[PDB]
Design an enzyme around this catalytic site. Structure first.
Site, PDB file in Angstrom:
ATOM      1  N   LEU A   1       0.789  -1.261   0.090  1.00 26.45           N
ATOM      2  CA  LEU A   1       0.049  -0.010   0.243  1.00 26.45           C
ATOM      3  C   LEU A   1       0.863   1.030   0.089  1.00 26.45           C
ATOM      4  CD1 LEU A   1      -2.831  -0.993   2.430  1.00 26.45           C
ATOM      5  CD2 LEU A   1      -2.823  -0.645  -0.087  1.00 26.45           C
ATOM      6  N   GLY A   2       2.082   1.093   0.542  1.00 29.26           N
ATOM      7  CA  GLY A   2       2.877   2.465   0.940  1.00 29.26           C
ATOM      8  C   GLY A   2       4.222   2.133   1.548  1.00 29.26           C
ATOM      9  N   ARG A   3       4.902   3.069   1.691  1.00 28.61           N
ATOM     10  CA  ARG A   3       6.419   2.952   2.190  1.00 28.61           C
ATOM     11  C   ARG A   3       6.558   4.287   2.749  1.00 28.61           C
ATOM     12  NH1 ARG A   3       9.822   5.619  -0.408  1.00 28.61           N
ATOM     13  NH2 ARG A   3      10.124   4.585  -2.190  1.00 28.61           N
TER      14      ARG A   3
ATOM     15  N   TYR B   1      10.020   4.560   8.295  1.00 31.14           N
ATOM     16  CA  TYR B   1      10.111   3.637   9.194  1.00 31.14           C
ATOM     17  C   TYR B   1       9.169   2.196   9.075  1.00 31.14           C
ATOM     18  CZ  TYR B   1      12.101   7.253  12.225  1.00 31.14           C
ATOM     19  OH  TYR B   1      13.076   8.527  12.574  1.00 31.14           O
TER      20      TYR B   1
ATOM     21  N   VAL C   1       3.770  -0.746   4.255  1.00 32.07           N
ATOM     22  CA  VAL C   1       2.232  -1.039   4.691  1.00 32.07           C
ATOM     23  C   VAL C   1       1.867  -2.179   3.826  1.00 32.07           C
ATOM     24  CG1 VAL C   1       0.114  -0.337   5.244  1.00 32.07           C
ATOM     25  CG2 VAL C   1       1.976   0.729   6.267  1.00 32.07           C
TER      26      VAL C   1
ATOM     27  N   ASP D   1       2.544  13.306  15.694  1.00 31.56           N
ATOM     28  CA  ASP D   1       2.814  13.274  13.966  1.00 31.56           C
ATOM     29  C   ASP D   1       1.322  13.391  13.618  1.00 31.56           C
ATOM     30  OD1 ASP D   1       4.107  13.263  11.653  1.00 31.56           O
ATOM     31  OD2 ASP D   1       4.004  10.840  11.562  1.00 31.56           O
TER      32      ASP D   1
HETATM   33  C1  LIG Z   1       2.008   4.037   8.959  1.00 34.01           C
HETATM   34  O1  LIG Z   1       1.530   3.246   9.953  1.00 34.01           O
HETATM   35  C2  LIG Z   1       0.330   2.773  10.168  1.00 34.01           C
HETATM   36  C3  LIG Z   1      -0.460   2.648   8.964  1.00 34.01           C
HETATM   37  C4  LIG Z   1      -1.840   2.164   8.975  1.00 34.01           C
HETATM   38  C5  LIG Z   1      -2.787   1.646   7.811  1.00 34.01           C
HETATM   39  C6  LIG Z   1      -2.541   2.266   6.543  1.00 34.01           C
HETATM   40  C7  LIG Z   1      -1.375   3.061   6.124  1.00 34.01           C
HETATM   41  N1  LIG Z   1      -0.540   3.768   5.604  1.00 34.01           N
HETATM   42  C8  LIG Z   1      -3.757   1.863   5.355  1.00 34.01           C
HETATM   43  O2  LIG Z   1      -4.460   0.905   5.981  1.00 34.01           O
HETATM   44  N2  LIG Z   1      -3.630   2.444   4.197  1.00 34.01           N
HETATM   45  C9  LIG Z   1      -4.471   2.010   3.405  1.00 34.01           C
HETATM   46  N3  LIG Z   1      -4.476   2.177   2.090  1.00 34.01           N
HETATM   47  N4  LIG Z   1      -5.326   2.019   0.867  1.00 34.01           N
HETATM   48  C10 LIG Z   1      -6.299   1.178   1.979  1.00 34.01           C
HETATM   49  C11 LIG Z   1      -7.529   0.534   1.216  1.00 34.01           C
HETATM   50  F1  LIG Z   1      -7.279   0.973  -0.066  1.00 34.01           F
HETATM   51  F2  LIG Z   1      -7.138  -0.814   1.308  1.00 34.01           F
HETATM   52  F3  LIG Z   1      -8.591   0.520   1.906  1.00 34.01           F
HETATM   53  S1  LIG Z   1      -5.942   0.892   3.330  1.00 34.01           S
HETATM   54  C12 LIG Z   1      -2.320   1.529  10.172  1.00 34.01           C
HETATM   55  C13 LIG Z   1      -1.514   1.796  11.404  1.00 34.01           C
HETATM   56  C14 LIG Z   1      -0.121   2.388  11.122  1.00 34.01           C
HETATM   57  O3  LIG Z   1       0.652   2.563  12.204  1.00 34.01           O
END
Ligand SMILES: COc1cc(/C=C(\C#N)C(=O)Nc2nnc(C(F)(F)F)s2)ccc1O
Length: 329
Positions: free
Chosen positions: A44-46, A49, A52, A155
């Site tokens: 999903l992302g980077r 730290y 995801v 943050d």
């Molecule tokens: C980056 O730190 C966290 C991240 C997350 C969750 C996401 C991020 N980044 C997350 O769920 N992102 C999503 N982006 N698209 C999503 C979808 F499309 F699946 F709904 S979920 C949860 C707890 C954290 O501590």
């Protein structure tokens, strides 16, 4: 000589009177789940730290999200895990479901509830006046909860506020920078995104508290109701303070640093200038006026104070007339 000490005006002694196990995260013992329960679906992302991933928990057929931590101090990892466990179940706090050891990174992977997010660029282009009030109130629930539990997030920014708009569902995420508040403790000022950094951070005042999050929330609010993202758009940490001073004025900045016997970086001598405090009405125009009200501006005004001790607390904020139109559960 040197700077004057400061204490939070609320929730000052929460960690003092909780048992040591609550805040002593260095001694926390992690209970590991089974990494094979989770099948990674897509990245999903980077970030600095973590990475995801969307995943499936194949033991219950539910969608989850997996945050694989990048190598960092054991202390920072245990801090985040302990804070997440302490806050679990709180209003609009992202729910930690599991902790596993990733076999490839050989670091902890935090498993969270799945929130069906729309990223904040398209969402913020749409949100109505009512939407913004609603979601601000939801953020405040999360912040009053974590503050009341002795924790500052440090943050707060749009990227860390997940919204599933379809279900009017909000979660505050990435507690990787969050800390326990202890009266008299000096903290790292290298926290928060530049645009959301409080004046306390920008003048290197280390004895800050929960009220940092309220400055950050104010920056988010300003960006949403005025349709300018980010609102204070500094090119570095010095220019960030200058941008703030061009709106809040330099005389109240000097009052702030004089109150705490703080000295500005001499580097500001040739860049800060002299600036009047501006009225918030100057940022209103025909393309954002539908998002602005006297209540919005007053609320914003009471969040964005130089003096961290002068900002609304999260609970006080929830009492503000801006939220009178929001339907309460
Ligand atoms: C980056 O730190 C966290 C991240 C997350 C969750 C996401 C991020 N980044 C997350 O769920 N992102 C999503 N982006 N698209 C999503 C979808 F499309 F699946 F709904 S979920 C949860 C707890 C954290 O501590």
């Amino acid at each position: 000589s040197g700077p004057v000490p400061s204490r939070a005006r609320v929730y000052t002694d929460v960690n003092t009177h909780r048992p040591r196990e609550y805040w002593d995260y260095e001694s926390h013992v992690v209970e590991w789940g089974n990494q094979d329960d989770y099948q990674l679906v897509r990245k999903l992302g980077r970030g600095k730290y973590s990475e995801v991933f969307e995943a499936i928990n194949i033991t219950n057929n539910e969608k989850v999200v997996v945050k694989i931590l990048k190598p960092v101090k054991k202390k920072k990892i245990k801090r985040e895990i302990k804070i997440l466990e302490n806050l679990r179940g709180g209003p609009n706090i992202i729910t930690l479901a599991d902790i596993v050891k990733d076999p490839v990174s050989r670091t902890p992977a935090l498993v969270f509830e799945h929130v069906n997010n729309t990223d904040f660029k398209q969402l913020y282009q749409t949100l109505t006046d009512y939407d913004i009030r609603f979601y601000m109130y939801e953020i405040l629930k999360a912040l009053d909860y974590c503050h009341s539990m002795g924790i500052m997030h440090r943050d707060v920014k749009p990227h860390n506020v997940m919204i599933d708009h379809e279900h009017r569902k909000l979660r505050l995420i990435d507690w990787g920078l969050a800390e326990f508040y202890h009266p008299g403790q000096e903290y790292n000022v290298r926290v928060a995104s530049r645009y959301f950094k409080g004046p306390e951070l920008l003048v290197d005042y280390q004895m800050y508290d929960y009220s940092l999050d309220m400055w950050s929330l104010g920056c988010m609010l300003a960006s949403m109701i005025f349709r300018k993202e980010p609102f204070f758009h500094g090119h570095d940490n010095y220019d960030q303070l200058v941008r703030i001073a061009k709106v809040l004025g330099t005389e109240d900045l000097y009052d702030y640093i004089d109150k705490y016997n703080i000295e500005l970086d001499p580097r500001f001598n040739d860049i800060l200038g002299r600036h009047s405090r501006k009225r918030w009405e100057r940022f209103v125009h025909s393309e954002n006026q539908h998002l602005v009200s006297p209540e919005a501006l007053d609320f914003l005004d009471k969040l964005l104070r130089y003096d961290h001790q002068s900002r609304l607390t999260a609970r006080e904020a929830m009492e503000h007339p801006y939220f009178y139109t929001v339907v309460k559960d």
